[PDB]
């Protein structure tokens, strides 16, 4: 009943307060930050620019890359007054963008679900990654991972007829043979930062304050490089998620 | 009990129509030193721990629902108006602090209207798109004129194109989820807020990040009968809560 | 010796929601300490109880955080919210924003009203909740027969109105997926006219917010029909 | 009876860093005894604390294990190391050599200076550490405003200067992978001129070594961009 | 270390009447309470004892 919104808050009632009624509440857990975000969701896909026997090289094709950034937020070959520089590794973008004329598909990669619904300012967690084959041919593929901020080491094949990506002390994966088609695994919160920005970082990324405003540095879970004969759908999963400082969700269009 | 006073060093706010002090995240900046810095911090500078009272804006019948002004921190107090606090801040790499604020605005029993006064972490303060670089303009400066709401709050892109949305999007229909209070002409002439220290890191490279923003937004338009005092200002008393400084050096030339 | 195993028909299968973990490839990695942080929360449900704004449509059909009243008793209702998470005037409230990610709900909805007209203004309103079965009310008189409360203006600026959870089933679907369309209506009427003195703005604005009440819960996490902000 | 099993989607997959062992094919093999050995160590981190040489560039641009000073007070700085593992004058120190195999660091860097000029020579230096935010110092006067220590020549030949770990984040990236370029600078200045008597070499050389300080740590083992020695 | 296993000849096989359960994909879901209900039964056999009509044929 009667109250005062001015003070920053109000009585949070149930039927029994103003009327001859009562609390109808039942136990229920499924609405918890952790449990809720703890399910798999696609953010993009990987397409090999080259064989399992050669030297790897950044490669784009119809918005598809042979390498991808592990973050919920939007990403893509770095943008430029003259167009996204496709000869390079993807980076975090500040907005979502149509692949072409019509809205879909998207040029950018990201967790659309998480974007349309991230009721919070900061978050953190571990990331469980799943890489599933889109094709039906006996697979021969190599996958390389690296933590946020690490050298891409996108150098030349040392050993002929073998995959350059496999040539590293970093965590790499080798998948090959009939029936062997999906890669699954989990990586640690590997960022230099204490917590990550769910949406926006109200500051410059460089000391000169001239560049990339709104994007926090190393605000991601590292990245993936692929090589071999198979393209794959890539999904992420929020492990032991934690969120802070509540904020507004993505706007929804009012009915005409 | 609607009459209250708050002192801070050689400064003191005072009000006869308060509705209490809303304390965000249910807690305050305690002034702890950052575990990320080896050097003993500079703290507890009385001269720097007070209310800096300044002008916010002129409220008129013209402004509509959700029109607003954004005030960035610490930035807005990093220069001259910040006195000793700004002076000390300018000479340190890192600063970690909370904020205690009082927003003031009076009218009369014959005036109508209401404001949403609140504080948000990582809230977009960019003014416009810088022609050439594909970046914002004056992120760290306070709005000098009311800002019109977006019919469809999808944010601001810098690539000069439109479509979908930007990460700097802010959906006003939900602004009350942020720590806030409502300034209602018929009820009160002041609002009192307070926030802790939050951020992507243990302490802040302030020079390049406005982690907190003080926002004043209109809910219901200002209204008054002819003859009624037409001139209505909105001012504010801002105070740094337990500022803690690290990484002393030659002075950053905000100027 | 090796253990003999029976390999189940469902092998090699991947489950988006599999209740189990997978292989760790970068172990013993410390998670950058964040003990300094404040503002943390665990349950999406809480966000639901924070009152946020209802979008009220204008003739030229554009939205306001409120509705208006004056020195008259409009024969019809001032505003009318349809108790239904899917419902549109809520399209943009935290309550609805969270709710669309879940299949079912239970409990009270709380409608919050805030009077922003001048201190010198007075008057009374009649807020009501009408359950289905006899159709939606077309007159204060009818509304008055269902669940209602009188809201009196005065010193205290606001009013919290609770739409009771009255239903055949323990739960209710959160979305207009096919058509039973609703779970009743919340209607706001003038009981007495807004009254006041000369020199006072004749048209007062009443802020309209909505939120999940105390009893309230959501369940079964799902995906909404995908959308694109305008 | 056989145990029924659910075969996970990720089968047949090989993990370079898999936290587990594999099949043994030549068991019960004794490992040739080496109990006689000395010089053993367990932590790469220790190698990090052993001070090694900084490579100082000459006009014709070739490197020296040191820098020179004389009977003058150069208006500008004598040498300047950029606190940044990736940084080049360290390119060849054990500290950097180890650090490039790890993604992040934390703690103090220790800069070691050794005076090799003649016993009869005297003088004083001003070593300083400047954190970012106001740009790198361009004058002793400015440097003097940041973290600093005065180094006085005398009987004792050397000096250990600690670049404090002052930072926003609990950790810092070890590599110049994209561009925030640095974490401040270490600058060396003359406070007073090197002074001495007739019959003494007017230009003294100061050995410059660097190492990880006590507080210091590294984490997340990785691979550096591959290289080829000249 | 991995456990060595002998994979039985009958692998990948599906059993309509398999005496065991399978993988759960929507856990922790509460089953809408029905404590109000009456008329419940457990054994098809009981239905058997309820006398019902014999169909007697006419010319």
């Amino acid at each position: 009943g009667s109250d005062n919104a001015e003070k920053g808050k109000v009585s949070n009632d149930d039927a029994s307060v103003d009327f001859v009624a009562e609390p109808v509440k039942l136990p229920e857990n499924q609405t918890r930050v952790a449990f809720f975000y703890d399910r798999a969701v696609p953010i993009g896909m990987l397409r090999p620019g080259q064989n399992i026997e050669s030297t790897f090289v950044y490669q784009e094709n119809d918005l598809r890359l042979n390498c991808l950034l592990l973050t919920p937020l939007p990403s893509f070959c770095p943008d430029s007054t003259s167009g996204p520089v496709k000869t390079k590794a993807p980076v975090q973008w500040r907005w979502v963008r149509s692949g072409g004329t019509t809205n879909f598909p998207l040029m950018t990669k990201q967790d659309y679900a998480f974007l349309c619904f991230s009721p919070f300012t900061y978050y953190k967690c571990d990331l469980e990654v799943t890489v599933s084959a889109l094709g039906t041919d006996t697979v021969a593929s190599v996958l390389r991972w690296a933590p946020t901020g690490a050298p891409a080491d996108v150098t030349d094949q040392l050993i002929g007829y073998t995959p350059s990506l496999g040539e590293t002390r970093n965590p790499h994966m080798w998948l090959v043979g009939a029936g062997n088609t999906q890669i699954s695994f989990v990586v640690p919160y590997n960022s230099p930062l204490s917590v990550l920005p769910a949406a926006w970082f109200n500051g410059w990324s460089d000391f000169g304050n001239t560049k990339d405003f709104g994007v926090a540095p190393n605000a991601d879970f590292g990245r993936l490089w692929i090589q071999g004969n198979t393209s794959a759908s890539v999904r992420i999963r929020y492990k032991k998620m934690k969120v802070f400082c509540p904020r507004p969700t993505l706007f929804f269009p009012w009915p005409v | 009990d609607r009459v209250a006073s708050d002192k801070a060093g050689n400064s003191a706010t005072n009000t006869q129509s308060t509705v209490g002090r809303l304390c965000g995240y249910g807690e305050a900046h305690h002034g702890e030193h950052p575990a990320s810095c080896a050097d003993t911090a500079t703290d507890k500078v009385l001269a720097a721990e007070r209310y800096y009272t300044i002008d916010l804006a002129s409220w008129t019948t013209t402004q509509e629902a959700f029109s607003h002004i954004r005030i960035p921190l610490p930035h807005v107090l990093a220069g001259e108006d910040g006195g000793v606090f700004g002076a000390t801040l300018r000479r340190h790499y890192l600063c970690k602090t909370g904020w205690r604020v009082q927003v003031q605005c009076n009218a009369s029993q014959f005036h109508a209207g209401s404001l949403l006064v609140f504080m948000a972490p990582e809230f977009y303060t960019g003014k416009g798109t810088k022609t050439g670089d594909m970046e914002p303009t004056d992120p760290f400066t306070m709005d000098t004129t009311w800002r019109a709401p977006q019919g469809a709050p999808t944010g601001y892109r810098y690539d000069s194109r439109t479509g979908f949305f930007a990460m700097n999007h802010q959906n006003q229909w939900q602004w009350t989820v942020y720590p806030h209070q409502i300034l209602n002409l018929r009820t009160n002439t002041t609002v009192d807020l307070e926030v802790p220290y939050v951020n992507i890191a243990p302490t802040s490279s302030w020079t390049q990040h406005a982690n907190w923003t003080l926002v004043v937004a209109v809910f219901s338009p200002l209204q008054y009968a002819s003859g009624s005092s037409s001139d209505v200002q909105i001012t504010a008393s801002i105070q740094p809560v337990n500022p803690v400084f690290n990484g002393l050096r030659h002075e950053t030339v905000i100027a | 010796s090796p253990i003999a195993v029976t390999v189940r028909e469902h092998k090699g299968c991947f489950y988006s929601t599999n209740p189990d973990t997978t292989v760790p490839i970068y172990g013993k990695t410390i998670s950058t300490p964040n003990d300094y942080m404040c503002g943390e929360f665990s349950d999406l449900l809480e966000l639901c109880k924070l009152p946020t704004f209802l979008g009220n449509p204008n003739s030229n059909n554009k939205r306001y955080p409120y509705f208006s009243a004056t020195n008259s008793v409009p024969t019809t209702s001032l505003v009318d919210y349809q108790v239904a998470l899917s419902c549109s005037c809520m399209c943009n409230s935290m309550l609805a924003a969270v709710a669309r990610n879940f299949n079912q709900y239970r409990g009270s909805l709380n409608f919050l009203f805030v009077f922003t007209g001048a201190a010198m203004v007075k008057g009374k309103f009649l807020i009501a909740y009408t359950p289905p079965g006899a159709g939606k009310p077309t007159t204060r008189d009818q509304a008055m027969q269902a669940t209602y409360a009188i809201w009196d203006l005065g010193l205290n600026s606001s009013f919290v109105f609770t739409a009771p959870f009255i239903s055949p089933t323990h739960y209710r679907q959160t979305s207009y997926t096919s058509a039973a369309s609703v779970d009743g209506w919340v209607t706001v009427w003038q009981l007495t006219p807004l009254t006041y003195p000369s020199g006072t703005p004749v048209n007062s604005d009443i802020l309209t917010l909505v939120s999940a009440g105390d009893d309230f819960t959501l369940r079964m996490p799902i995906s909404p029909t995908k959308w694109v902000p305008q | 009876s056989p145990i029924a099993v659910t075969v996970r989607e990720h089968k047949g997959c090989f993990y370079s860093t898999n936290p587990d062992t594999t099949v043994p094919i030549y068991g019960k093999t004794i490992s040739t005894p080496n109990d006689y050995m000395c010089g053993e160590f367990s932590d790469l981190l220790e190698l990090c604390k052993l001070p090694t040489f900084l490579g100082n560039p000459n006009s014709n641009n070739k490197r020296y294990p040191y820098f020179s000073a004389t009977n003058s007070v150069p208006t500008t700085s004598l040498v300047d190391y950029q606190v940044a593992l990736s940084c080049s004058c360290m390119c060849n120190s054990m500290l950097a050599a180890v650090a490039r195999n790890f993604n992040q660091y934390r703690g103090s860097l220790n800069f070691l200076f050794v005076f090799t000029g003649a016993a009869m020579v005297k003088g004083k230096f001003l070593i300083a550490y400047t954190p970012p935010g106001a740009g790198k110092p361009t004058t002793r006067d400015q440097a003097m405003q940041a973290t600093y220590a005065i180094w006085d020549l005398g009987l004792n030949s050397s000096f250990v200067f600690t670049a404090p770990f002052i930072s926003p984040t609990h950790y810092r990236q070890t590599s110049y992978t994209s561009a925030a370029s640095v974490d401040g600078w270490v600058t060396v200045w003359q406070l007073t001129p090197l002074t001495y008597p007739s019959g003494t070499p007017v230009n003294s050389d100061i050995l410059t070594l660097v190492s990880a300080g006590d507080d210091f740590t590294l984490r997340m083992p990785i691979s550096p961009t591959k290289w080829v020695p000249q | 270390s991995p456990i060595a296993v002998t994979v039985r000849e009958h692998k990948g096989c599906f059993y309509s009447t398999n005496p065991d359960t399978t993988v759960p994909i929507y856990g922790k879901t509460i089953s809408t309470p029905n404590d109000y209900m009456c008329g419940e039964f457990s054994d098809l056999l009981e239905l058997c004892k309820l006398p019902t009509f014999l169909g007697n044929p006419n010319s």
Partner: peptide, 25 residues
């Protein structure tokens, strides 16, 4: 707390299966 419902849920040691939580202060 999260979406995990398996009893035998250890196999890989805790410290390997998850980032190690540690408090700066």
């Amino acid at each position: 707390s999260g979406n995990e419902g398996v009893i035998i849920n250890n196999f890989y040691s805790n410290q390997y299966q998850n980032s190690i939580d540690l408090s700066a202060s």
